[PDB]
Design a protein around this ligand. Structure first.
Ligand SMILES: Nc1nc2c(c(-c3c(Cl)cc(Cl)cc3OCCCC(F)(F)F)n1)CN(C(=O)NC1CCC1)C2
Length: 210
């Protein structure tokens, strides 16, 4: 288990998002889905010069899996995924050029759904999630898991669970008062609102253990 610190601006934003109120916290789903689509875009781009790269899965898509038992909403894509370095760099440690700008707009009163515009729309998941786990697998590396509950740091281990062919899985351990987003009905409407121009298939798998 490795522990890493967040780049100071990202760490600062996370604390702003967590502690500020918005009437409007569901744009986080738009964001993780946009991310997934870009990942899909990416592996698709790579495969145009090398078919073999799709030997870890020909289908390109996004699943949504609300789990009420475990109070977790999961977003899964068979996209490009991340190598270990990719994971450590892109989910906290390297400065994103839009972080400052976005914090100023928030200051000026900008609504939170602006966040997509600044390339930091992932950290919006912490509007609804006390904890986030990202499990990723890239053709060029083994499978890893990234964890953070904010508070300045994240961790990275290898993940032993169910091997993905390829892609990324963002698991949201929801806050107590954010459980409406496990509601099938709530997820139907949200996708229909913020994600009707996503060029990949999106399926809703409702998970319940017996
Ligand atoms: N679903 C999903 N997949 C991926 C990523 C994210 C993501 C996360 Cl978890 C957190 C944040 Cl802050 C942003 C994110 O994405 C922004 C769009 C990235 C783009 F998709 F364009 F690659 N989310 C990141 N990834 C890589 O960096 N891959 C390396 C490119 C070489 C392999 C795959």
């Amino acid at each position: 288990v490795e522990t890493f610190a967040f780049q100071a601006e990202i760490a600062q934003l996370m604390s702003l998002i967590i502690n500020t109120f918005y009437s409007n916290k569901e744009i986080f789903l738009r964001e993780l889905i946009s991310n997934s689509s870009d990942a899909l875009d990416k592996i698709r781009y790579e495969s145009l010069t090398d078919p073999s790269k799709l030997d870890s899965g020909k289908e390109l898509h996004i699943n949504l899996i609300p789990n009420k038992q475990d109070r977790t909403l999961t977003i899964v894509d068979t996209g490009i995924g991340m190598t270990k370095a990719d994971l450590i760099n892109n989910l906290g440690t390297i400065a994103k050029s839009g972080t400052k700008a976005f914090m100023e707009a928030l200051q000026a009163g900008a609504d939170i759904s602006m966040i997509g515009q600044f390339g930091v729309g992932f950290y919006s998941a912490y509007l609804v999630a006390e904890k986030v786990t990202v499990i990723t697998k890239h053709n060029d590396d083994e499978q890893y898991a990234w964890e953070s509950s904010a508070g300045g740091s994240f961790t990275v281990r290898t993940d032993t669970g169910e091997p993905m062919g390829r892609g990324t899985k963002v698991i949201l351990h929801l806050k107590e008062d954010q459980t409406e987003y496990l509601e099938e009905r709530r997820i139907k409407e949200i996708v229909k609102k913020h994600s009707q121009f996503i060029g990949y298939p999106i399926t809703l798998f409702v998970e319940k253990e017996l």
